[PDB]
């Protein structure tokens, strides 16, 4: 008989501990694995695939239309859309990125925001996208917007433009749930010159917008998502 002493914590059950256990089914042989395409190893692998952002959130019931950012022909100087960058809330929240970020407490890294244009091929347009780093207000006019991170996008044969929100930060991690100290800025978009439709054409054209994370990205300290809850256990 070897002398032992038990410490504080004996008998506790910590849902996060990782130890060995007896197998209830001694000697059982599991089914062989066969090959299946698509294996995922890290959630970091999947948040780099871009998905659509319901940017046009202004509706009243969920609709395919809140994915469409409208553009008006012949407007000059004006603003196309605006949003803050609380990736865990608001427009971002239902996107795959938003949806995964919510399983973690802290995030750090660059984001990739792209816009794909869908107007007739014989039209043309020049837009400016601007990222405003924390510390200033959402820009109120392009002059204000153009003094921060921006890209003049020229609509052409190449249909999409990929803007990166480079990680601009004092503190090396931000909270995924919106927090002030930790806030990330604003994203706005304005006409640089203006949309022009060809003859025989009319109305609004739309941009689709996507979001995905750069390879830069870090997420840490897992927790429970506000995105799902329940009141009684389900049954069959």
């Amino acid at each position: 008989g070897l002398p032992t002493t038990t410490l504080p914590g004996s008998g506790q059950f910590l849902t996060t501990d990782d130890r060995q256990s007896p197998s209830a089914l001694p000697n059982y042989e599991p089914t062989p694995r066969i090959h299946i395409p698509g294996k995922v190893h890290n959630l970091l692998e999947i948040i780099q695939v871009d998905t659509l952002i319901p940017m046009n959130n202004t509706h009243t019931k969920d609709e395919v239309n809140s994915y469409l950012i409208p553009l008006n022909a012949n407007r000059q100087n004006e603003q196309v859309f605006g949003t803050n960058l609380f990736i865990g809330d608001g427009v971002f929240k239902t996107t795959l990125l938003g949806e995964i970020v919510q399983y973690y407490t802290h995030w750090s890294g660059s984001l990739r925001f792209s816009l794909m244009y869908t107007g007739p091929a014989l039209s043309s347009a020049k837009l400016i996208l601007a990222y405003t780093p924390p510390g200033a207000r959402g820009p109120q006019d392009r002059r204000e917007a153009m003094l921060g991170t921006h890209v003049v996008w020229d609509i052409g044969l190449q249909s999409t433009i990929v803007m990166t929100i480079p990680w601009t930060s004092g503190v090396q991690f931000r909270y995924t749930d919106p927090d002030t100290y930790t806030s990330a800025g604003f994203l706005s978009c304005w006409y640089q010159t203006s949309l022009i439709l060809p003859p025989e054409t009319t109305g609004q054209v739309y941009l689709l917008s996507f979001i995905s994370a750069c390879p830069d990205f870090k997420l840490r300290l897992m927790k429970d998502t506000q995105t799902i809850s329940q009141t009684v256990a389900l049954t069959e």
Partner: protein, 255 residues
């Protein structure tokens, strides 16, 4: 002078040419291949009809109009009646296959509109009734007709609400599945190569569909002034590397 843009796919006794492609997607970066022995379980030698089943079948055409919500086809169902592919299907106990899907929609440089073409492995549909109402067989086996998401709820059928992918997930995130867009201004076809994806090496072709192909208008169709307000969309699909096993009497399936 090769462009990403022009392409030719020859499979069996049938060929497709596109002069306005946008590359092609190969699901999960894997190309269809036959079933290796190391992965095999059933001891039966399989049948590989080759060129008589691995050719291109063009399903009947759809009509995109400003009110369209989107269409959904299931595989191998959509092909249950195409030539010898279909016969083999009803006659063997088990079968396995990959596909090349080519979705076509051309317009002019004055039109606008953008379709999402996506392949969803194991797309289990939801009942519009809620609770634990099931979706009857016939409803998930529309055949070449596919399911028309702008048709009405029916009884025992699935829900046809587009912002929810027919299953409780948001349209916006379908982009995590192999997919390609058809943006009239860019593109006129979409091509996806689908490798066989299952948790068993070979399965039944009639009780289980392993992918749904979905074509969904996202930026509404907008035709030039006084143009007819609609465009046809055509889907052509070719089984590839097909194998059938466990031949016998010929399945009888509901309806």
């Amino acid at each position: 002078g090769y462009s990403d843009r022009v392409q030719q796919i020859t499979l069996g006794n049938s060929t497709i040419t596109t002069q306005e492609a946008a590359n092609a997607v190969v699901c999960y970066a894997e190309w269809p291949e036959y079933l290796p022995d190391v992965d095999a379980s059933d001891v039966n030698k399989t049948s590989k009809p080759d060129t008589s089943v691995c050719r291109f079948y063009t399903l009947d055409s759809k009509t995109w109009t400003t009110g369209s919500k989107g269409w959904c086809w299931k595989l191998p169902d959509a092909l249950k009646d195409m030539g010898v592919f279909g016969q083999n299907m009803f006659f063997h106990s088990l079968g396995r296959s990959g596909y090349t899907v080519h979705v076509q929609c051309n317009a002019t440089k004055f039109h606008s509109g953008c379709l999402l073409v996506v392949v969803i492995p194991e797309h289990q549909l939801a009942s519009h009734e809620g609770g634990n109402v099931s979706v009857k067989y016939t409803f998930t086996h529309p055949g070449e007709r596919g399911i028309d998401l702008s048709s009405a709820n029916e009884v025992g059928g699935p829900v046809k609400d587009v912002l929810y992918n027919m299953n409780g997930t948001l349209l916006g995130n379908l982009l995590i599945f192999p997919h390609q867009f058809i943006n009239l201004r860019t593109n006129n076809t979409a091509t996806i190569v689908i490798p066989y994806i299952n948790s068993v090496p070979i399965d039944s072709m009639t009780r289980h569909n392993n992918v749904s192909l979905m074509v969904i208008p996202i930026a509404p169709l907008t035709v030039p002034t006084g143009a007819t307000p609609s465009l046809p969309i055509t889907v052509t699909i070719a089984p590839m590397c097909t194998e059938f096993s466990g031949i016998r009497s010929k399945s009888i399936v509901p309806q």
